[PDB]
């Protein structure tokens, strides 16, 4: 029932983590200047 919603949310959070990492990674590169 309400377990399929949990699966999608875990997916959405991974994407969020990936985006956060990417931006941190990008910001750090900019900071070294």
């Amino acid at each position: 029932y309400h377990l399929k919603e949990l699966r999608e949310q875990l997916a959405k959070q991974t994407v969020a983590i990936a985006e956060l990492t990417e931006e941190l990674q990008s910001k750090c590169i900019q900071l070294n200047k």
């Binding site: 991974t14 990936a18 070294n32």
Partner: protein, 160 residues
């Protein structure tokens, strides 16, 4: 804290030692036994602190922002090596064009049961512009050397 932060993903068939490669590098642990998780380890490269978040086992999110990839197989299980071609394509399809890739032959401690000749594996790696090294998560061989290698190649690239 850290100066840089690099995302590095582990890919390869199940049971090759991906999880154990991660545990040994990040906390010096090896075991004998899901979802998606990751662990961090910081190393020094050129006086800089490099923080690596290593990912193990949505396919597009997994590769998203990944600047490095360890393609892992089993040197005693030739099937895991025959499937390297498949994993490489998934990388090429779902990841960045400038990603640093290293072909890792794990379980080097099973040389007596070797099914994949190292010259053949390197030949594959060199042709496909892949880095190559044999590791053993069990007895901690070349694990530090593997990660430090790929993290350095990545660093030198972003140093532009």
């Amino acid at each position: 804290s850290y100066d840089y932060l690099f995302k590095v993903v582990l890919i390869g068939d199940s049971g090759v030692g991906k999880s154990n490669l991660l545990s040994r590098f990040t906390r010096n642990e090896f075991n004998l036994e899901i979802g998606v998780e990751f662990a961090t380890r910081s190393i020094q490269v050129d006086g800089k602190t490099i923080k690596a978040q290593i990912w193990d086992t949505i396919t597009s999110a997994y590769y998203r922002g990944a600047v490095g990839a360890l393609l892992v197989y089993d040197i005693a299980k030739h099937l895991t090596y025959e499937n390297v071609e498949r994993w490489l394509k998934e990388l090429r399809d779902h990841a960045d064009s400038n990603i640093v890739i290293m072909l890792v032959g794990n379980k080097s401690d099973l040389r007596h049961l070797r099914a994949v000749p190292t010259d053949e594996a390197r030949a594959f790696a060199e042709k496909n512009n892949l880095s190559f090294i044999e590791t053993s998560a069990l007895d901690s061989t070349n694990v530090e050397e593997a990660f430090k290698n790929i993290l350095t190649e990545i660093y030198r690239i972003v140093s532009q």
